[PDB]
Amino acid sequence: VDCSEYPKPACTFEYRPLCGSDNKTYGNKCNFCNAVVESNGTLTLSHFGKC
């Protein structure tokens, strides 16, 4: 996952989880990438799937 085209003002809501370096499960890639932007690039991907 590349969050380069983020942020996005809206995300669809299917669930395909990713596990962030903050130990939070992100519900989909769009949600994860908007969070990376919001953290100003400090959040990273820990692994695919739930945390």
Binding site: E5, K8, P9, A10, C11, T12, F13, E14, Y15, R16, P17, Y26, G27, N28, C30, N31, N34
Partner: protein
Amino acid sequence: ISGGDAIYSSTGRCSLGFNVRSGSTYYFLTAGHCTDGATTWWANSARTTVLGTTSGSSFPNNDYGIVRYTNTTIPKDGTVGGQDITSAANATVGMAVTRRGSTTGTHSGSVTALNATVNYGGGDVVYGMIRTNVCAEPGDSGGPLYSGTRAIGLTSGGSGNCSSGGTTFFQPVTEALSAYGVSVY
């Protein structure tokens, strides 16, 4: 199984919008972004209970899809959780609505705008959407938006979350019904 319940495809989990039928053929509606590229759907994460197979899918532009039931014994309730649905209606600004989804459950709010354009990026743009102040989170895609016993829309997407508040867009269900020649029951 009824509106708002989890549905699983090969790729992830969405929510069932509404159970609908044409003649003697039963189907369920859900979001097009969930039906896109999915063939078979199941009722559980283990994929042991089959529901059926995708029969139509419209996304982007619109955001609806329909799955034809192949499972003969599963109960196909014409409700949303326990709520009965008896008809479909057009959304209006100011209308109180309720959404149900497989991740967040039931949340209420109101329609704040019609015919909105939502750009999910990469050329995925959807038009004609209902905007509301109801929250939603991943997994809630495709679930029903209803008002009383009236079917109004299918959850498509948005921002924010249920803890802090959000904005969610829904595909008008009337359009899907029409496209597929099916009706709620």
